[PDB]
Amino acid sequence: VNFEEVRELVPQKYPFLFIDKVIELQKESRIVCLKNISGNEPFFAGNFPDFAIMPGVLIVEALAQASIILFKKVFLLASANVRFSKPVFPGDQLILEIDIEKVISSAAIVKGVAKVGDKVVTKATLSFGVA
Amino acid sequence: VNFEEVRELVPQKYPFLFIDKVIELQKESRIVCLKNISGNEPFFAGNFPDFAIMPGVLIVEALAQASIILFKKVFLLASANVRFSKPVFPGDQLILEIDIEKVISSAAIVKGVAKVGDKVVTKATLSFGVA
Amino acid sequence: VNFEEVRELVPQKYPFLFIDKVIELQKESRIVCLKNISGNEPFFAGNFPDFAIMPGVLIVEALAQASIILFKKVFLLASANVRFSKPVFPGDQLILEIDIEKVISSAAIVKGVAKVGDKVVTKATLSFGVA
Amino acid sequence: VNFEEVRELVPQKYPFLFIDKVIELQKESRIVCLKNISGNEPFFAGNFPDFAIMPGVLIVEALAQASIILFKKVFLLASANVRFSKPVFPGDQLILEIDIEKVISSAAIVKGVAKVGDKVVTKATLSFGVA
Amino acid sequence: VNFEEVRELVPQKYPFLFIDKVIELQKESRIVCLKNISGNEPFFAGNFPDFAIMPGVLIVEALAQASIILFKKVFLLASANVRFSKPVFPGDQLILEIDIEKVISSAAIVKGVAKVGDKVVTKATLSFGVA
Amino acid sequence: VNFEEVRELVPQKYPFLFIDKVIELQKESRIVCLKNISGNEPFFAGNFPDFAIMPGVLIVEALAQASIILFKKVFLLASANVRFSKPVFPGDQLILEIDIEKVISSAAIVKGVAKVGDKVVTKATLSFGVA
């Protein structure tokens, strides 16, 4: 899955698109997404202008958009249980791993793991409604 | 506390500032913040261009920035346990209520409630580290 | 009239859309519009970075876009006679009241009143051509 | 007066700076300003995406910022009486002519004329307060 | 050729559109383009905030987009041999002169000359592929 | 060299900063820079909205900013001889290799090679003046 297929499946767009490409797919099982962290992104201007750090809530959004890609292969975040372990900086390559716990007809609960290299930077349990 | 005092205490800035003014303060107890939701904000262009809805993760950030105001009256989100109850639209006036559970020397855990009018739209438990 | 109906009737869009919702309608008589003033709007960065104040000309544009909503329920500002009474700040809720003086086949002249709470911040007489 | 002296005297900045250079100066008498109209300006995206036309209220702001340059050689628009004669498009070179009617200790009233080539596109009478 | 015909022929758009209008056309021979340089363009914020100078690579892009207009009257820059002679500032009117050396079925090589007034600011030889 | 040292040495800033971190340094010999290509960068909206491709001239700017880092360890692009070999897409990791040919007191000529993985995407010879 390339970038044109990302913009098609992810309902968000610039400046709120936080998926760059698709690394590994396993329909109804696991997805591994990739987002490049660049200092030329607009939110780096506004989140701590003294020193560039990626906001933790945007990592949660990146995990949510990756989960949506797994689903469509109208979802909406119903809940999030997140721990922010380590910071992400410009130049980092954020790996987004999504594992489905199990899916019902109107809801889905997933495991979210964000990594830079092999260091875990964010773990999350996300639930989605339908509208 | 006015807007010039908001930009001073909130380390974020545009386009990632999500506090407009300060409604009610109770140092080391409760804060009630206000953020205006306007269709002229940049994220509305990118989050569902078909229909404007405020991303849930940005409400979590608004609750986090309001908690930071309560604290400074270097914090960093360590965890978040959030349920997104109802959507927020352009024209809504987001009320952000923060209640401290209790604070230790190096961490803080708060209750977060986001409201439009009196309908609760987001409830959250947030924890903060120090760096 | 909701926000999706606002973007449909107002020919402007981001970052030059200055109407959030529709409070009161009286076709061919009066309209009462609402615009939320938020510090996260792009023009606040550039208009006096030392202290956030909403430019007066953007209030005139908000009154003009509200008048256009009243009309379509191709107009173009032909003239404006405005007095700027008091400033508007982030967090303010701008009320836009438009009263038609009377409409001819090719022109319209309206009364424009911008309010925060009940304090009048801007009064204007606007005329529109057709193209 | 060059562009670095423009940003110094004009309290506005990007994306609300509407003066590019200074053509002719006559302290306490007349100023002739220049603003380049380019399709790469942010407001052209949002004002009529079907066809690029410069909003009339931004011409009023350009005339106001030019008047401020004449003054400082804390002003704030108190009133504006404007007629919008003809449209301005990307590629146009907007000439801004300001003539002081006369100045008192706490207020100033000026004549504003915006031109492209020699066609008058906007005439205005502006008044300024002090704060 | 007006601005609506520019956006139609130039595949780029905001904030990467660097052609404002069309001054002189000679199909399969010469084109003379116009781009207004304004301090209100987004790249002026980021290229030397101490003093506004237009990046040289954006002049090369303006010459490339002007060459594309000459062609379509799917091209892609294959090579560029450029010398940057003198700087361009806000308020300058950039003239872009393109002369075809000769065109084959799958490639084109042109002469590019950027001028402000009659001073040459950029000379370039550009080649284009097809995809 | 980290990102805070990049913003210090590179005179450009957002939205015209095209260096994320520093991989390998050899003062007065070679530098290897890194820029993450993300679909959330502003120029991707405007360069071919149908399909995201990084403009070739921005790769030249990335090579120029990397050369400036090598130098300061007031330069200005005097000339560029570039061949654009293969496209760069969102998600790519652009490697920027700069080799000094030799430096005189008032000018510098370098070899520029941009790579994604090990595929060469851009080769360039750049010369810099001083002001």
CSV table of C-alpha atoms in Angstrom, one decimal, chain B residues 25-121:
chain,number,residue,atom,x,y,z
B,25,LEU,CA,-9.0,29.1,39.2
B,26,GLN,CA,-8.5,27.3,42.5
B,27,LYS,CA,-4.7,26.8,43.0
B,28,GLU,CA,-3.8,23.2,43.9
B,29,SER,CA,-7.5,22.2,43.6
B,30,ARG,CA,-9.6,22.8,40.2
B,31,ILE,CA,-9.2,25.0,37.0
B,32,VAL,CA,-11.9,25.7,34.4
B,33,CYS,CA,-10.5,26.7,30.9
B,34,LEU,CA,-12.2,27.9,27.7
B,35,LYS,CA,-11.3,27.1,24.1
B,36,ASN,CA,-13.3,28.5,21.2
B,37,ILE,CA,-13.8,26.0,18.4
B,38,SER,CA,-13.8,27.9,15.1
B,39,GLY,CA,-14.0,26.6,11.5
B,40,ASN,CA,-11.1,29.0,10.7
B,41,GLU,CA,-8.7,26.8,12.6
B,42,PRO,CA,-6.1,25.0,10.4
B,43,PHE,CA,-6.9,21.4,11.6
B,44,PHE,CA,-10.5,21.7,10.4
B,45,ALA,CA,-9.2,21.8,6.8
B,46,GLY,CA,-7.4,18.4,7.3
B,47,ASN,CA,-9.7,16.5,9.7
B,48,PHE,CA,-12.6,15.2,7.5
B,49,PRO,CA,-12.8,17.9,4.7
B,50,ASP,CA,-16.3,16.4,3.9
B,51,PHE,CA,-17.5,17.5,7.4
B,52,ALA,CA,-15.8,19.5,10.2
B,53,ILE,CA,-15.4,17.6,13.4
B,54,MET,CA,-12.7,18.3,16.0
B,55,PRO,CA,-10.2,15.5,16.5
B,56,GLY,CA,-10.5,13.8,19.8
B,57,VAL,CA,-6.8,13.8,20.5
B,58,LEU,CA,-6.8,17.6,20.3
B,59,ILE,CA,-9.4,17.7,23.1
B,60,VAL,CA,-6.9,15.6,25.1
B,61,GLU,CA,-4.2,18.2,24.3
B,62,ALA,CA,-6.6,21.0,25.4
B,63,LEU,CA,-7.1,19.2,28.7
B,64,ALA,CA,-3.4,18.7,29.1
B,65,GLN,CA,-2.6,22.4,28.5
B,66,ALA,CA,-5.3,23.4,31.0
B,67,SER,CA,-3.7,21.1,33.6
B,68,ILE,CA,-0.3,22.7,32.9
B,69,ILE,CA,-1.8,26.1,33.7
B,70,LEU,CA,-3.1,24.7,37.0
B,71,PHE,CA,0.4,23.4,37.8
B,72,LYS,CA,2.3,26.6,37.0
B,73,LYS,CA,0.0,28.6,39.3
B,74,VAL,CA,8.6,21.3,33.0
B,75,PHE,CA,5.5,19.1,32.8
B,76,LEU,CA,5.0,16.4,30.1
B,77,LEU,CA,2.2,14.0,29.4
B,78,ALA,CA,3.1,10.6,30.8
B,79,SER,CA,-0.2,8.8,30.3
B,80,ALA,CA,-3.9,9.4,29.3
B,81,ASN,CA,-7.0,7.4,29.8
B,82,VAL,CA,-9.7,9.0,27.8
B,83,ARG,CA,-13.3,8.3,26.6
B,84,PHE,CA,-14.6,10.4,23.8
B,85,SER,CA,-18.4,10.8,24.4
B,86,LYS,CA,-19.8,13.3,21.9
B,87,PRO,CA,-18.4,15.3,18.9
B,88,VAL,CA,-17.4,18.9,18.9
B,89,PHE,CA,-18.1,21.2,16.0
B,90,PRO,CA,-17.2,24.7,14.8
B,91,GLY,CA,-19.0,27.2,16.9
B,92,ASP,CA,-18.9,25.1,20.0
B,93,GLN,CA,-17.4,26.6,23.2
B,94,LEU,CA,-15.3,23.9,24.8
B,95,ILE,CA,-15.2,24.1,28.6
B,96,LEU,CA,-12.2,22.3,30.2
B,97,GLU,CA,-12.5,21.3,33.8
B,98,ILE,CA,-9.3,20.0,35.6
B,99,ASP,CA,-9.4,18.5,39.1
B,100,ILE,CA,-6.2,17.4,40.8
B,101,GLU,CA,-6.4,13.9,42.3
B,102,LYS,CA,-3.1,14.7,44.2
B,103,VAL,CA,0.4,15.9,43.4
B,104,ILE,CA,3.7,14.5,44.4
B,105,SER,CA,7.1,16.1,44.0
B,106,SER,CA,7.7,14.6,40.5
B,107,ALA,CA,4.3,13.6,39.2
B,108,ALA,CA,0.7,14.7,39.0
B,109,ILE,CA,-2.6,12.9,38.2
B,110,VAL,CA,-5.7,14.9,37.3
B,111,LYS,CA,-9.3,14.5,36.3
B,112,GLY,CA,-10.2,16.0,33.0
B,113,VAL,CA,-13.7,16.9,31.8
B,114,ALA,CA,-14.5,18.7,28.5
B,115,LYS,CA,-18.0,20.2,28.1
B,116,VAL,CA,-20.0,22.1,25.6
B,117,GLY,CA,-22.7,23.8,27.5
B,118,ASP,CA,-23.4,21.2,30.1
B,119,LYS,CA,-23.1,18.1,27.9
B,120,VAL,CA,-19.9,16.2,28.7
B,121,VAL,CA,-18.0,15.5,25.5
